[PDB]
């Protein structure tokens, strides 16, 4: 009664009076611009997309700590005054492309790497989710891990399941998008990726399939020989040009890290080397059982037979035989897939592309 009349009543009345004063500031004569520089005199020069020049003062609700060069502030049409700081107009429009919040992945499909899975967890999942581990002991957690191995081992799926446990934004980078040839432009795009990761501080940085130009391998976007120097050394200048104790963790992954520049490896940031291998026959039943959980199997079909037949195959090859055997019975409109479809699937998918060494016995 007494407190509610002296608090709630003047609060709702003051908020309505502040909006009335915005008619001379945020009212219809309103425009925007691009901030250039700020001076200690409470004045700045801002250029709108129509390329004018406006030198005015700074209004309320905003300080100079939030005003940075290159951003977009808010202007006025008549008085031309700077209102306040705002985010990127229309936004960069980067929401989910290489980045997301909580991807859906488990440890069953990546099974078989458990020997090397405990290495990435303790160096990434443990320090990020449990920061008290390295703080109480005073040790420095690994600031990055390198990924090397044959494809099909779930290289992307390895860090995908870790991102769901950390409950943080998981960044990715395509190797071919940084080397795009417009004019130069190679190092310019690299800075914009790490700049966004510094504002919100997701504390997760990952790169999938590092390629650049080893030799050629491109047509539309080439870059020449000068692109190799300005690209591969730009990723080095991120860790070498800045010292970040506990936040940015850079993780690099590709098919072959040997041909890469030893300077690009940046020793001392990545203290862990993880090797990828194909899963053994013991872990194939976990992946096969998931895809066949919704599949109708006949009485003569045994799961232990398909696992024994598989020799030197990736994780995608387990679901490939289930897809091929499922389409054979789908064309004939059968409920339970016959054992003949499973036999023809495991034999065909085994040898398709390269049947023979083409020369000698090797």
């Amino acid at each position: 009664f007494v407190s509610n009349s002296e608090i709630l009543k003047p609060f709702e009345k003051k908020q309505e009076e502040e909006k009335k004063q915005l008619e001379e500031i945020r009212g219809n004569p309103l425009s925007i611009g691009t901030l250039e520089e700020i001076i200690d005199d409470d004045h700045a020069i801002v250029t709108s997309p129509t390329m004018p020049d406006y030198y005015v003062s700074i209004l309320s609700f905003v300080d100079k700590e939030l005003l940075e060069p290159g951003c977009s502030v808010l202007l006025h049409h008549k008085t031309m005054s700077i209102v306040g700081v705002l985010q990127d107009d229309a936004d960069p429009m980067v929401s989910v492309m290489k980045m997301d919040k909580s991807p859906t992945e488990s440890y069953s499909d990546i099974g078989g790497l458990e020997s090397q899975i405990q290495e990435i967890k303790e160096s990434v999942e443990l320090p990020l989710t449990h920061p008290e581990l390295y703080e109480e002991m005073g040790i420095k957690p690994p600031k990055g891990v390198i990924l090397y191995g044959a494809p099909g081992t779930g290289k992307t799926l390895l860090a995908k399941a870790v991102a769901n446990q950390t409950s943080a934004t998981f960044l990715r980078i395509v190797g071919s998008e940084l080397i795009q040839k417009y004019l130069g432009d190679g190092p310019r795009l690299c800075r914009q990726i790490f700049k966004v990761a510094g504002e919100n501080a997701p504390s997760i940085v990952f790169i999938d399939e590092i390629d650049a130009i080893g030799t050629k391998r491109y047509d539309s976007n080439s870059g020449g020989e000068r692109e190799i120097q300005r690209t591969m050394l730009e990723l080095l200048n991120q860790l070498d040009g800045f010292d970040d104790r506990g936040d940015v963790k850079v993780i690099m992954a590709t098919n072959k890290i040997e041909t890469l520049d030893p300077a690009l490896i940046r020793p001392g940031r990545i203290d862990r080397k993880i090797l990828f291998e194909n899963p053994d026959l013991s872990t194939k039943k976990k992946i096969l059982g998931i895809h066949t959980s919704k599949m109708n199997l006949s009485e003569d079909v045994n799961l232990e037979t398909l696992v024994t037949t598989k020799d030197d195959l990736s994780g995608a090859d387990i679901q490939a035989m289930c897809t091929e055997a499922g389409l054979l019975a789908l064309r004939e409109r059968r409920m339970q897939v016959t054992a003949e479809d499973f036999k023809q699937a495991k034999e065909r998918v085994m040898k398709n592309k390269v049947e023979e060494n083409l020369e000698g016995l090797y």
């Binding site: 407190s3 449990h130 920061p131 008290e132 703080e135 109480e136």
Partner: protein, 612 residues
Amino acid sequence: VACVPLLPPPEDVAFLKTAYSIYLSQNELTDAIALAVRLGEEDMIRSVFDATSDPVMHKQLAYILAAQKTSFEYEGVQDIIGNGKLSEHFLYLAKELNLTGPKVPEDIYKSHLDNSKSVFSSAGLDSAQQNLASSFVNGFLNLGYCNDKLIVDNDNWVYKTKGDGMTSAVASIGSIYQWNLDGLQQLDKYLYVDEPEVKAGALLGIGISASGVHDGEVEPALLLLQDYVTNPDTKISSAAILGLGIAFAGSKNDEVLGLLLPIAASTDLPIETAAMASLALAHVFVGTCNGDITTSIMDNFLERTAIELKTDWVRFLALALGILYMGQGEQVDDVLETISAIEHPMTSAIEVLVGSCAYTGTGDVLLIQDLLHRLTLAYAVLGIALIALGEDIGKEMSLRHFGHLMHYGNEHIRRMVPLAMGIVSVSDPQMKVFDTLTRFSHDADLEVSMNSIFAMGLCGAGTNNARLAQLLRQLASYYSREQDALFITRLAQGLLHLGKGTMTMDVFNDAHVLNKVTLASILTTAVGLVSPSFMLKHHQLFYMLNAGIRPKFILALNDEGEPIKVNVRVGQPVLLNHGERAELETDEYISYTSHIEGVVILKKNPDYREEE
């Protein structure tokens, strides 16, 4: 087990209650496991002991029985029946009376923390004004570690304090000696000296050191302490209600019940010193079945018997009813009569959430819809916190609901949001509540700021910095001002060193059921903690956290359950033994009956002889 609890986004656990009809005269070795856990009806828990004739298998059932509490707590299982019995379906030995509960193992656990000790900030300082600051710090910092340097040699941080400061100074000594075989003989120095001020802290220190053991280990020492409840002395009567009330948790006695009725009815501040007396009946009798305890408070609520005058204590009686109707079934109607009698701002949301223990569950359709009508007050967030645990639909909405409700005149709703979120803050870190604490730190009165530092410490209690780096920036605004302000700023820092820096807050057990005794300490501090707010009562209100702290241990036992070192999967120091420190560790080995994590008894197949 893996189907009934969660099919849909929500959860309904009430389906196990209907099974009692068909399993009445039969049950099963496996069936009695699911009935004894979760809801844990009195008839369901006693069924697993009847279906199992092996007295060795009855041991493992007793280790989880002490953690469940609820149904079987007071006399009739523990104490009298727990001393010993000879029959087929009982088989309660003396080892089950002690080794199962935190009685014998807490002493062996106390010696393990001596070698794990870290750098301590403990100091005696000089003046009694700043001795109270170090008294609260030394209480939770040295918990589990015996320190004889400050307690014996230098009494400057004890003897110089007088009044309520002397009562809180000895409370730190009881916490240092907590989890010991006998905590009464350690306080015999200050037990009887000269004044009742020195004699007051003894009952508060013994009550904290006796937390977890109601009947004593080798002697009924706490039974003789029931005569100190009613005292004409001033300071002793204050510490006897709150201190012994924590130690008496789990004991149903008409003597303690009869003495606390006139204390809370009259509410005599200079003599009886009644503060937690309303919550003393709630914390001691939680989990029991009493139909007359709500009626006696109902008559004192409406009539205001004896000299009871101030309306703040009148609301405290209605808020103390919240724990009283838990597990009482259809007896919740006594609380509904108090809401329609005297209208309070916190009683509008009580009538909605009385169905938590009445319907044997929460998260219903009408329960959620009625909370939106009351909010669009302070009590409505209790049932929402229970929904966020088993249901993620209301958990996301609770983030926006808890944010707007933290702004209110009284501090009741202000202390409930960080306390409920702080317990689950270790599992699910949330910085949305910490951002609201900015205005809650500096609002108007410095007393609100004094209660703000202690409220922020309950969130990260048992963890120093780490995920609190975002919250630590709010704590950096308070360092040192004056001698009296040192006790204000050290409220959060004292809780960061709890358990020597590493602790885990667990309000539930491995049986998939929450402990009502631990839940009783949540509403105890919410209704309490009046000293940092207006109308300062007693400084002893800062030690109520020990009533809800669950001991962290895992027993390594042989096939016979004897306290012998067994080599198995290690926990959280590197050798698991009886009373060894570990937490959050699963078990893949086969056990006798009702396989649980933590404390478990393991067996080996007859084909080989092994300790696993």
